[PDB]
Design a protein around this ligand. Structure first.
Ligand code: CD4
Ligand code: BCL
Ligand code: BPH
Ligand code: BPH
Ligand code: SQD
Ligand code: SP2
Ligand code: SP2
Ligand code: SP2
Ligand code: SP2
Ligand code: SP2
Ligand code: SP2
Ligand code: SP2
Ligand code: FE
Lengths: 55, 281, 246, 42, 307, 55, 31, 55, 46, 43, 31, 43, 31, 55, 46
């Protein structure tokens, strides 16, 4: 586990860091969209109900 | 990373806007001013599609469908959930496609090649804008545009077609189909002929363009030549899309009835309209 | 067979569509690896092998056997530039342009680039010089269109560079491939036919100002042009579109 | 190695990378804990 | 505006060009035809020569008899009247046997017998043209790519007129010979099978048909854009890569992040076109034999919404 | 003088915004042309049914 | 119809602007 | 964290600042359009209902 | 501030100002269109 | 660094010209927003 | 009332613009 | 090690100005979130 | 009560931006 | 250069139109202040009769 | 045109351009107000 630093002997950090940036963004966007699709977790619709913000 | 021959071509200049501000590459991809514009519109349009999937309440990518405003909204704005997202994604699609063509013009300038590729792509853009913009604006409602959905845009093709009976009878649609089929024939032949010369029978030398000319003359008594075939493949593709756009811009704007009824003008020419017999007598 | 499923909704039309996705993934892998026979392995801007070679491997070598005794080509293969490139980095990072260190038209870089093609003529199927001056192929004549021979050649500066003295024809393809231009010192040059406009009273060469015509790389034999010479000429003229200043 | 990083360059770069990894995940754990307090998913 | 190389500026005409010999049986090759100055603006001016031989004669005679059999039926349907023949030319139709006759050859000449006779001459004409396309390549020592490409179109044509009628059990399933009637057949086929848009192999076939217009537009524009470097001489660019092939490759690499070669773009070309009628033929072969309502099949396979 | 530098920055921005305005209003006039031709044609009489189930 | 005659009038006006603008770049191109 | 400045030894600022500029504008525009898509948070409709405009 | 002026040593101001003119115009057009798409602010529907 | 070839003093001068216009443009925008908020407030 | 609080917010914003504009004329009055 | 050509002190210089912009931009954003939460809280 | 506690959290966040900004300026003098 | 003369004429006109704009919008904001104070006061309840015979 | 350029030898262009900026702005405001006063063109009555 101490030699995990040798990853950078194989993969150029410029490629890894760009790839990692894209991946983590699209994963976070995926999960936020899944929750906004889920009525029990859509925070905008939850607070709408909590404060009687429609009808 | 570079192709082994690529380095000598990565010179500055040829940019239309932005000078050297964006004159760089990102991996293989050239950026430039319109590459920044392209990626923004592409990413925004894609992300608004995923958000429309949330509003629609499906994650099956084949059921995701972004509908235009209903006909009651005319050419005005609609609510985002009810046609307004489609309108923004249409702006993003147009922005992305146009920026992509302009980015191709810059790459042509940097390589010193002709502008045929971005010019040919501009025909596809005009066919798109015919279906989402020019014809809906002529007919007076965004709801005559097609929905962004893998299968639901085929429902629009079906429902639009059968509004005028069998759509095979649109005479410009017939011409477009003839170019589409002839283009696919020519692409099969051109691919095969070049490959059959470069990849002869085992042990034989590579064939020359003289053998290519000879094979087709032997086969059909004519040979368009190396330059003629690439002119033909371009013009067949562009003609197909021109007559496609034409067939739709007339449909529902100057022709309203069943397209099959158009062909009676020939049947009812007065020198033969009344002659007994045949199918129409 | 209508409605018959092995399991679930999996009928014989499901078997077909899933089999096609496997075939398509196999075909796309075949097509891309075939297209890696030129220009690979990928290089760093210094010329060393890039650590990232992409997801597809190189295909196994194929050998083309060339006609007229010109040997065999194996692809992929050792693939040096085999010439000097007069460019310098404009940044230490990768991905930026490399600026010409001298005169890019004459150093042959950017849109003025040319390749070390074979220094022999291209041959027809019989093994004759494919491209010839029309005077050297007695049956040929201009059969339609404005005959350019005898017209003055104008540059984009709008000044006369020379006059057209011959057409160089592709013999098997029977098409005009170059105009020969006689300059104001009586030495000639070849112009690519696709770079000129044969107007009613002139030939207009929108790529070149009238002074740049002397810089056109000259052919070594007055009766044939080699593939190396063609690339130098065609590259030089197209480079003018970027590099011919007003 | 393919990158041309020396062993000490790789071990240096990993140490700073681990610092960003632990920082980023530490923020994420606070975010999860807050939302588990606000609205448990189990 | 500059020259775009779409039409030639100057035509030159040499002697007639008789073409390569190889193992071509030169007694079977005609004289050269006339030159066309009109064709010379866009491509080659020379017509001819043409090779005939045995599969040539077989194909041309059977193809003539196919065409003549339809023509006489149209003259009969016109009632021999030369005016009605030109009025109704697109409305005439040689229809296949009625469904009650099944696959039996017992249908009357006016109720489908002439359609079987016409279809037999078409069968021999097309298949003998295929062997001709194979053997003309063999005589020149060329690869058989053109004959194997043509086999993909024959596959769809065989499915439409032969295989699917046999598997459905009647010749009434086959296509009528007529301009508007094969269009009416195409429309009726989709209605009977419940909207052919929801056939996934019709979807694929369209993807490759659009892709063929996409790819030939891209390739034709590319080669014209580099034609100023002699890039239309693609075989010499395969044998001895020039600046034309490199500029073409770097345009697409810089545009879309990957590129072809001069040889390898013609493999994309052949497969993009071949897959039109390969997937097409499968999609028709499944229609009625395996799926009788593609829209409902689409609903069960997650591509249309449920009721 | 500093004023010449003020005006040079304004000029560079008006180059940008002028081109962007030329494309925007040029598009709007192309849309206008199709709207004018729509008014000339008998479309309001023969108005087609909606092709989408959303209406 | 006779409405779109007005659309043409604006295009005639815009051609006068082009002719005037280029002339203004001619009549003192230091000329 | 005291070595995060070495990111500028991995990545050239001319590309990074362009990438970040597009990223931050893209992210902001999507969050505004998501809120405008939401009846509880569409501020232009909240004010229309508040002020008895067309709603 | 302190050193924000150093951005003009990274990016060429001539090119940035032309590109910023395009941005600001399109942003303005975008916001006007957002309002025109909204019934309570469509000033062109008279 | 110093990719543009401006000197540090040229950059300090230009940034003030730019920033002066930024505050002017945004001041004009605030006046336009204040006018719109009086006529037709959005909060 | 609590509406006109917003009118004051815009005036606070406009004072920031004044302070910024004069500062921009200070921090390079060649100074 | 350096892929960009920046010296270490140049990288520290650029980073410290970069972080000033990040904290400034994020401060402006917190005030916008605060105002919006005061007006219409989402929790 | 997440109203009041919300205000507090946002005011706490801003104090970290104050720390970080002053820390950046404490670096940026060629420390 | 002729461009510096183009920008100088633009600058002189923007001096004029800028001052004329400042008095126009400054007046409009003064009118706005009196409209805002009119909204705060009980005037719509106690609205006075018209003082002119034209109404 | 011919000699209309001689107006810049009568009237000092610096002063004329500032005065013409005032004129054109007030003319523009005038015409917008004429339209806003007319019911079929009052775009601010939404
Ligand atoms: C509906 C039917 C449609 C149907 C759609 C159409 C289907 C029919 C057409 C099929 C076309 C096949 C395309 C192909 O041959 O790819 C291999 C070729 C090889 O290039 P190379 O140059 O020899 O080697 C790669 C590398 O050396 C290039 O240089 P570098 O490393 O410095 O920079 C990397 C590139 C892009 O590379 C990548 O993105 C990673 C490799 C992608 C391989 C894709 C196929 C295999 C994995 C598929 C599953 C990967 C799963 C993670 O440049 C950059 O990264 C710079 C940043 C810009 C790109 C940002 C991308 C953001 C992430 C978006 C998601 C991308 C997903 C691929 O090129 C590439 O690797 C890059 C291709 C980029 C455009 C691909 C567009 C085609 C569709 C997607 C790929 C095909 C699968 C459907
Ligand atoms: C209402 C109508 C239906 C419909 C019903 C059908 C039916 C039915 C069929 C298709 C098929 C096709 N459809 Mg569909 N289709 C519709 C809507 C569309 C739309 C659209 C935009 O809406 C498009 C683009 C398409 C597109 C297509 C093609 C992809 C495909 C035909 C490929 C081909 O090359 O055929 C043309 C090529 C051939 C027929 C091969 C011919 C080869 C033979 C050997 C040639 C012999 C020549 C002869 C001897 C003459 C010689 C003369 C010479 C001068 C000597 N369809 C709707 C839903 N479609 C076909 C398919 O494959 O479906 C999966 C098919 O059978
Ligand atoms: C005019 C002749 C043919 C043609 C030509 C052509 N197309 C071209 C070119 C040329 C010459 C290019 O140079 C260009 C290219 O780069 O090719 C690789 C392109 C191209 N043709 C493409 C596709 C395409 N062409 C098509 C057709 C044709 N293209 C014509 C038949 C079709 C169809 C359906 O017929 C498609 C799908 C792309 C591969 C490419 C253009 C890529 C591009 O614009 O990239 C920038 C944009 C993005 C990466 C994504 C944009 C995302 C959007 C903002 C959101 C999505 C909105 C969309 C409306 C949703 C639709 C949903 C569907 C289910 C309806
Ligand atoms: C891969 C899919 C595509 C495809 C491919 C394809 N087609 C092909 C090929 C390929 C690769 C060939 O090699 C082959 C060919 O030779 O092309 C030039 C062919 C071909 N594709 C053809 C057509 C065709 N392809 C089509 C489509 C497609 N082809 C797809 C798009 C279509 C349609 C509807 O889309 C058509 C109509 C032909 C041009 C040709 C096959 C020719 C053939 O089989 O002909 C049989 C008939 C005859 C030989 C003669 C008919 C009668 C004539 C009038 C001659 C009469 C002579 C007589 C002596 C006269 C006497 C008169 C007396 C009164 C004196
Ligand atoms: C210093 C500058 C000063 C500028 C002064 C102000 C000028 C404003 C006027 C502009 C004149 C031109 C406007 C266009 C023509 C017209 O009158 O239209 C008025 C009609 C209203 O018609 C309405 O009326 C129509 C009938 S009719 O035309 O009135 O007879 C009817 O058919 C329709 O249903 C109904 O909605 O609306 C339109 O045509 C819609 C314009 C759409 C523009 C945005 C498109 C966004 C949607 C998605 C598509 C994206 C495409 C992206 C392309 C890049
Ligand atoms: C599908 O269904 C659901 C979506 C609902 C659930 C399942 C989804 C799923 C399968 C999720 C999987 C998630 C995974 C695999 C997450 C992985 C996350 C990782 C590995 C994150 C790593 C983050 C690392 C970071 C942020 C590192 C940053 C490093 C920094 C800032 C420093 C970089 C280094 C330097 C500057 C030093 C440079 C050195 C020198 C010498 C110059
Ligand atoms: C002081 O330094 C600065 C802060 C100025 C710069 C700092 C350094 C730097 C280089 C930052 C870079 C930032 C970048 C790259 C930002 C990019 C932002 C983008 C890509 C924004 C895009 C916005 C697009 C908009 C608003 C589009 C609007 C389109 C509309 C409204 C549709 C109508 C418009 C038209 C018809 C015209 C345009 C054409 C088409 C086809 C849409
Ligand atoms: C989906 O989102 C919605 C559409 C709903 C809302 C949009 C949400 C969103 C993400 C908006 C983002 C907005 C941003 C980031 C705007 C940024 C604007 C900036 C940075 C503007 C800066 C402008 C600077 C200027 C104009 C500076 C000019 C300097 C000059 C001209 C030099 C000095 C010269 C003068 C003062 C005199 C000028 C000359 C004359 C003749 C008057
Ligand atoms: C539906 O999905 C949701 C929208 C809900 C998803 C939400 C989840 C998600 C994925 C959010 C992601 C958010 C992220 C990743 C936000 C990150 C923001 C960042 C990284 C902001 C950084 C801002 C930095 C700024 C403004 C920096 C400014 C720098 C300046 C002004 C200095 C520029 C440079 C110089 C002056 C040169 C310095 C010195 C020298 C010597 C050249
Ligand atoms: C009261 O009720 C109703 C309104 C209904 C009835 C009104 C009845 C009524 C009293 C109307 C009266 C109308 C009148 C008196 C109209 C008179 C109009 C005149 C005199 C117009 C003259 C126009 C002259 C022009 C535009 C001259 C332009 C000159 C130019 C551009 C050249 C300027 C000078 C130079 C360039 C310098 C030349 C050379 C040197 C060397 C300095
Ligand atoms: C080509 O010709 C040259 C440009 C070279 C000029 C030729 C030589 C020359 C010197 C001609 C001189 C012509 C003159 C003196 C013309 C004078 C015209 C006048 C006095 C026009 C006045 C127009 C007034 C208008 C449009 C007023 C509008 C007012 C509105 C819209 C209300 C809003 C305005 C305000 C809040 C400010 C009003 C003013 C004050 C003081 C409160
Ligand atoms: C001027 O008057 C003259 C008489 C001189 C000439 C008139 C020429 C004329 C008007 C010709 C008209 C031709 C037309 C309109 C032809 C139309 C053809 C069309 C549109 C055909 C479309 C599709 C055909 C297909 C798919 C056919 C497939 C056939 C196959 C696969 C053959 C299968 C074979 C059989 C079923 C036969 C089996 C028999 C035995 C013995 C085993
Ligand atoms: Fe080719």
């Amino acid at each position: 586990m101490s030699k995990f630093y040798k990853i950078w002997m194989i993969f150029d950090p410029r490629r890894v860091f760009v790839a990692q940036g894209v991946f983590l963004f699209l994963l976070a966007v995926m999960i936020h969209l899944i929750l906004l699709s889920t009525p029990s977790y859509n925070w905008l619709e939850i607070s709408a109900a909590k404060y009687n913000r429609v009808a | 990373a570079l192709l082994s021959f690529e380095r000598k071509y990565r010179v500055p200049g040829g940019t239309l806007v932005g000078g050297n501000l964006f004159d760089f590459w990102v991996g293989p991809f050239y950026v430039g001013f319109f590459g920044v514009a392209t990626f923004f519109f592409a990413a925004l349009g894609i992300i608004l599609i995923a958000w429309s999937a949330v509003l629609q309440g499906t994650w099956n990518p084949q059921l995701i469908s972004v509908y235009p405003p209903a006909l009651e909204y005319g050419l005005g704005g609609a609510p985002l959930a009810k046609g307004g997202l489609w309108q923004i994604i249409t702006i993003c699609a147009t922005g992305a496609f146009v920026s992509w063509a302009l980015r191709e013009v810059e790459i042509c300038r940097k390589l010193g090649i002709g502008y045929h590729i971005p010019f040919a792509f501009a025909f596809a853009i005009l066919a798109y804008l015919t279906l989402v913009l020019f014809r809906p604006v002529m007919m007076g409602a965004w709801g005559y545009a097609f929905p962004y959905g893998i299968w639901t845009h085929l429902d629009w093709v079906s429902n639009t077609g059968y509004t005028y009976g069998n759509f095979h009878y649109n005479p410009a649609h017939m011409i477009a189909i003839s170019f589409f089929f002839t283009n696919a024939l020519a692409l099969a032949l051109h691919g095969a002929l070049v490959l059959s010369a470069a990849n002869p029978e085992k042990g034989k030398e590579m064939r020359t363009p003289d053998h290519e000319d000879t094979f087709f003359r032997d086969l059909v008594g004519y040979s368009i030549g190396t330059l003629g075939i690439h002119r033909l493949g371009l013009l067949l593709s562009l003609s197909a899309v021109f007559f496609s756009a034409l067939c739709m811009i007339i449909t529902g704007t100057i022709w309203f009835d069943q397209w099959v009824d158009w062909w009676q003008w020939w049947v009812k020419l007065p020198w033969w309209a009344n002659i007994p017999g045949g199918i129409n007598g | 067979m209508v409605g018959v499923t092995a399991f679930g909704n999996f009928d014989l039309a499901s078997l077909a569509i899933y089999s096609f996705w496997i075939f398509l993934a196999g075909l796309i892998y075949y097509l891309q690896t075939e297209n890696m026979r030129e220009g690979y392995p990928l290089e760093n801007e210094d010329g060393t092998p890039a650590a990232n070679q992409g997801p597809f491997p190189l295909p196994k070598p194929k050998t083309f056997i060339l006609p007229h005794g010109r040997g065999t080509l194996t692809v992929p293969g050792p693939e040096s530039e085999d010439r000097p490139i007069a460019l310098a980095r404009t940044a230490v990072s990768e991905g930026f342009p490399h600026a010409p260190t001298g005169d890019p038209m004459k150093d042959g870089v950017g849109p003025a680039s040319w390749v070390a093609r074979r220094d022999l003529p291209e041959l027809d199927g019989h093994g004759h010089n494919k491209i010839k001056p029309m005077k050297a192929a007695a049956g040929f004549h201009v059969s339609a269109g404005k005959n350019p021979i005898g017209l003055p050649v104008r540059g984009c500066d709008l000044e006369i560079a020379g006059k057209v003295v011959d057409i160089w024809v592709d013999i098997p393809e029977q098409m005009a491939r170059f105009l020969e231009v006689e300059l104001k010192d009586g030495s000639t040059r070849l112009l690519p036919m696709q770079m000129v406009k044969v107007q009613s009273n002139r030939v207009h060469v929108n790529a070149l100002s009238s002074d740049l015509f002397a810089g056109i790389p000259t052919i070594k034999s007055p009766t044939e042009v080699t593939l190396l010479e063609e690339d130098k000429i065609c590259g030089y003229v197209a480079g003018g579109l970027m590099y011919a200043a007003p | 190695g393919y990158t041309g990083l020396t062993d000490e360059q790789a071990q240096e770069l990993h140490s700073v990378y681990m610092s960003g990894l632990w920082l980023f995940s530490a923020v994420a754990i606070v975010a999860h804990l807050a939302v588990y307090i606000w609205r448990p998913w189990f | 505006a500059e020259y775009q190389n779409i039409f030639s500026q100057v035509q030159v005409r040499g002697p007639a060009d008789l073409g390569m010999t190889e193992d071509v049986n030169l007694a079977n090759r005609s004289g050269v035809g006339p030159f066309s100055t009109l064709l010379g603006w866009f491509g080659n001016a020379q017509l001819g020569p043409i090779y005939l031989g045995s599969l040539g004669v077989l194909s041309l005679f059977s193809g003539l008899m196919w065409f003549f059999t339809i023509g006489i039926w149209f003259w009969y349907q016109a009632g021999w009247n030369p005016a009605v023949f030109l009025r109704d030319l697109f409305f005439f139709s040689l229809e296949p046997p009625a469904p009650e006759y099944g696959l039996s050859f017992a249908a009357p000449l006016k109720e489908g017998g002439l359609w079987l006779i016409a279809s037999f001459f078409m069968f021999v004409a097309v298949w003998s043209w295929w062997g001709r396309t194979y053997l003309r390549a063999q005589a020149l020592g060329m690869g058989k790519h053109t004959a194997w490409a043509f086999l993909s179109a024959i596959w769809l044509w065989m499915v439409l007129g032969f295989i699917r009628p046999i598997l459905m059990g009647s010749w009434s399933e086959a296509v009528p010979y007529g301009i508007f009637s094969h269009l009416d057949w195409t429309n009726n086929f989709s209605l009977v099978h419940g909207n052919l848009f929801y056939n996934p192999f019709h979807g694929l076939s369209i993807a490759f048909l659009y892709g063929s217009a996409l790819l030939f537009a891209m390739h034709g524009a590319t080669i014209l854009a580099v034609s100023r470097f002699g890039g239309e001489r693609e075989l010499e660019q395969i044998a001895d890569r020039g600046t034309a092939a490199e500029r073409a490759a770097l345009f697409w690499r810089w545009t879309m992040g990957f590129n072809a070669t001069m040889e390898g773009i013609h493999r994309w070309a052949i497969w993009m076109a071949v897959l039109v009628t390969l997937t097409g033929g499968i999609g028709i072969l499944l229609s009625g034999t395996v799926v009788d309502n593609w829209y409902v099949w689409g609903q069960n396979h997650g591509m249309a919404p449920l009721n | 003088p500093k004023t010449n530098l003020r005006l040079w920055v304004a000029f560079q921005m008006m180059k940008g915004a002028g081109w962007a305005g030329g494309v925007f209003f040029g598009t709007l006039l192309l849309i206008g042309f199709f709207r004018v031709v729509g008014r000339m044609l008998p479309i309001q009489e023969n108005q087609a049914p909606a092709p989408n189930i959303t209406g | 119809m006779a409405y779109m005659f007005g659309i043409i009038v604006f295009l005639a006006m815009l051609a006068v602007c082009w002719f005037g603008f280029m002339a203004a770049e001619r009549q003192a191109g230091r000329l």
